[PDB]
Amino acid sequence: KVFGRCELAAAMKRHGLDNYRGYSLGNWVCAAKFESNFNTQATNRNTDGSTDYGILQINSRWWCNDGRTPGSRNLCNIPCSALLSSDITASVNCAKKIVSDGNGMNAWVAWRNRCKGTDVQAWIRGCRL
Ligand SMILES: C[C@@H](O)CN1CCN(CC(=O)O)CCN(CC(=O)O)CCN(CC(=O)O)CC1
Numbered sequence: 107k108v109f110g111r112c113e114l115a116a117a118m119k120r121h122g123l124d125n126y127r128g129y130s131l132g133n134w135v136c137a138a139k140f141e142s143n144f145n146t147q148a149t150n151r152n153t154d155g156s157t158d159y160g161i162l163q164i165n166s167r168w169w170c171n172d173g174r175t176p177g178s179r180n181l182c183n184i185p186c187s188a189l190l191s192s193d194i195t196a197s198v199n200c201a202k203k204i205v206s207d208g209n210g211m212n213a214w215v216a217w218r219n220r221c222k223g224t225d226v227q228a229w230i231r232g233c234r235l
């Protein structure tokens with residue numbers, strides 16, 4: 107599923123991501139835009155053999171199980187395919203765990219390089235939230 111900007115903002119807000127760990131909703135929408143272009147089915151292989159999945163490109167090295175990242179963890183206790191669903195519940199609940207691990211949103215490289223330090227409210231501008 108490819109979400110519309112405001113559609114995703116509303117879904118993230120409903121799942122309690124807005125202001126989670128101090129990160130306003132625009133931060134999450136911006137991250138999602140550059141990580142997956144709002145596409146829940148996005149997948150990308152990393153140089154070490156792990157793969158990133160879903161709207162927030164969650165890594166199989168530590169967070170989900172994809173059966174092909176030998177030696178990895180599954181801290182969100184979910185198959186990585188659950189992160190590709192049209193329903194973002196799984197991606198949101200797992201993202202909450204990641205952003206809580208100590209390094210906040212810096213876990214998402216695209217957020218650090220393209221969202222951090224910018225007008226992130228612009229990402230939810232115009233939406234009826
Ligand atoms: C809770 C998260 O921290 C889990 N973590 C996610 C990724 N971490 C992020 C970080 O620790 O900043 C980077 C690597 N991490 C370095 C370290 O922990 O010293 C080793 C593996 N960790 C071991 C552990 O944490 O018990 C498991 C997965």
Ligand SMILES: C[C@@H](O)CN1CCN(CC(=O)O)CCN(CC(=O)O)CCN(CC(=O)O)CC1
Pocket residue numbers: 208
């Ligand atoms: C193996 C290293 O991870 C050891 N670690 C070095 C510093 N860590 C780095 C990091 O976790 O990325 C930062 C703080 N760390 C957060 C956490 O771990 O949850 C708390 C204490 N840790 C507990 C543990 O690790 O079991 C002990 C020392």
Ligand SMILES: [Cl-]
Pocket residue numbers: 171172173174175176177178
């Ligand atoms: Cl695996």
Ligand SMILES: [Cl-]
Pocket residue numbers: 117192193194195
């Ligand atoms: Cl949803």
Ligand SMILES: [Cl-]
Pocket residue numbers: 127128209210211
């Ligand atoms: Cl933080």
Ligand SMILES: [Cl-]
Pocket residue numbers: 130131132133226227228230
């Ligand atoms: Cl915002």
Ligand SMILES: [Gd]
Pocket residue numbers: none
């Ligand atoms: Gd860690």
